[PDB]
Each structure stands twice: as C-alpha cells, then as structure tokens.
C-alpha cells in the first residue's frame, strides 16, 4: 500500500481527500509524526520542508509549494508584481497598489493620490479621502447583476502538480451580494459568504457558471469563455509562470503540488482584475466531491498509481 499522514484537521478539502484515499483500499493513514510516509497533507504554518526527501527508499510528496507564500500574502503579492520584470507593474490586470507600514511607499501613495484627487478616486486598505498594510484602488465601476443591482466576485480553483502543469477546474463560483450597490453600510460593497449571512436570488449568495453564462448571453450577448475566461487563464498563467523558477521542485529531493484559490473582479466593461490569491482555500458543497477526486487522480495517483477531464490544462 501507499502511505500518507495528516497534519491539518481544519482543511475540509483534504479531509475529503484523505477520506477518499481511505476509500481506495490502497492507502493507509499513519500517526501525524511518523516520518516514513509517501504523502504529507501538511500544516498551514511552519511546514518543515527541510525534513522532506531524506528517507531512503521513499518517494515523498507534499500538498504545498515552499515559497508560494509570496503570491498569497498581500504585501508580498504587491512587491512581487512591482519588482518582477515578467510582471513589471505595468500589467493591466492588477489594480494600482502600495504597501504602507504603520521600503515604505507612503510618500509615493500620497504622491499619486495628489494627482488622482483633483480629478475622483476611492481606495481600500487591508492586510474617498486619504487622511482617513496594503492600499489599492477600489474598483468604483463594477459589473452589477440584474435584477438586484448587486456586485460579486469570481472564485477559480487551480491545481499545480509536481511537473508544474497548471490545471484550471472547469467549475468556478460567483460569490454575489444581496443588497444593491450604493456608491455614496459595507454589506453591498463587500462580497463574502459570512458577511452576507440573504439567499433571495440564488442559494447561499453563490451563482454557478452555467447560470452566469446564460445570463451573459441573454443580457450582454456574449459568453463567459470569451468575455472573461480568456483573461482569467492569462492571469493565472502569468502569476504561476512568474514564480516557477523560485518554487519548482523539478530537480528536488521531494515533490510538491498545491491547490490555489484565485479571486477576481469584473468591471462593467468586462475587464477582469485579479483581487487576490489564496493558498489554503475552501470550496463549494456541490463541487467538493468532483474537485477532490480530481485532486486524487491528477495530483496523487500521477506519482503513486493504482492497480473528459474536469480540468483545463493551461499550456505554457
């Protein structure tokens, strides 16, 4: 049989994955601190990558890429997009952003804000006036769904395997608002399941791709693939190819894969903007089984084999 361990009890995705692996009959779970394992479902923080790949006779695999935190932390994502010549800040799909400490970019952020304020501009900060961490431009003109006059975000799940193939899960999720967008209460400005909880138009304030595509057809005479998906695939490919030399495990003594959650925003001109990248994302109940089984087939059995695909391979 094959060997795996579990070191994160809060991951619903990998709890399902481990359950499926036990439902295979060829995988068996070990105590969390047993070093003789083939597969590690590791912890979120301080994952001891240095201890992997030193067990004689074991091919060892882990569900995280060391160094991928640069893409999944907000300040480091800003710094990466600004300082990487492959992105060079001049990329058209990431909002104008500056990192501020409580080098510092305070003088430059206020400097560009001086040109922006005279005309307007509204900004956002997390980790209309500047006097009142990362501060980036708040997209004041988002695409609003009708009926409802409400905003949304797009969550895409992306699997990167040990060969650095990039797989885009065919099913994404729009996380929508319920209250009409008011550009003058932050519930209509903020798209989050927890914040919304509601549930009038769709179940759980989340709409799936077939329905959203039919809406794009009927309302705007276009398709989701043409108006949005080309941009999403381009952004994913750029972000991951950019850091490939820093995180690739191609000639390394252990191997990595990882599941990412990309979050996007669409403006009223059908332009896609990358909001953020999640390194330990959740999923949708209707998609847990499919996506997890796909994780097993494409990420795990590809290295440890047993006795149409749901992914789109983003060539590069």
């Amino acid at each position: 049989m094959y060997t795996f361990v579990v070191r994160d009890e809060n991951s619903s995705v990998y709890a399902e994955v481990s359950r499926l692996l036990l439902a295979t009959g060829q995988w068996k779970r070990l105590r969390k601190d047993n070093p003789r394992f083939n597969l590690m479902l590791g912890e979120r923080n301080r994952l001891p990558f240095g201890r992997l790949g030193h067990e004689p006779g074991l091919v060892q695999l882990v569900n995280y890429y060391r160094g991928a935190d640069k893409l999944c932390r907000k300040a480091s994502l800003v710094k990466l997009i600004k300082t990487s010549p492959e992105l060079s800040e001049s990329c058209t799909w990431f909002p104008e952003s500056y990192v501020i400490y409580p080098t510092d970019e305070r003088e430059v952020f206020l400097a560009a804000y001086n040109r922006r304020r005279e005309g307007g501009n509204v900004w956002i900060a997390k980790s209309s006036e500047a006097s009142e961490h990362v501060i980036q431009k708040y997209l004041e003109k988002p695409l609003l769904l009708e009926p409802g006059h409400r905003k949304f975000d797009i969550r895409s799940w992306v699997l990167v395997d040990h060969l650095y193939n990039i797989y885009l899960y065919r099913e994404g999720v729009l996380r929508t608002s319920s209250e009409p967008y008011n550009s003058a209460d932050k519930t209509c400005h903020l798209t989050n399941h927890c914040i919304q909880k509601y549930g009038r138009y769709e179940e759980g304030n989340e709409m799936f791709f077939e329905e959203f595509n039919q809406y794009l057809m009927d309302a705007l005479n276009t398709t989701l693939e043409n108006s949005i998906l080309l941009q999403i695939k381009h952004i994913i490919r750029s972000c991951l190819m950019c850091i490939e030399p820093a995180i690739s495990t191609k000639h390394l003594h252990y191997q990595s894969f990882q599941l990412f959650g990309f979050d996007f925003m669409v403006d009223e001109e059908l332009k896609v903007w990358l909001i953020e990248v999640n390194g330990a994302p959740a999923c949708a109940q209707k998609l847990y089984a499919e996506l997890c089984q796909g994780i097993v087939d494409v990420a795990i059995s590809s290295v440890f084999p047993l006795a149409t695909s749901i992914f789109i391979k983003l060539h590069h």
């Binding site: 990558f49 240095g50 790949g53 030193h54 060391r66 160094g67 820093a246 000639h251 390394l252 003594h253």
Partner: peptide, 14 residues
C-alpha cells in the same frame, strides 16, 4: 546551483 550536485542536500533558493 543545482541541489543534486551539492555536498549537503538543502535548498539555497530559500
């Protein structure tokens, strides 16, 4: 700069 040629296995990128 390849780990496979080092006298001690580790990742200098990090």
């Amino acid at each position: 700069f390849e780990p496979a040629n080092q006298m001690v296995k580790c990742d200098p990128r990090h």
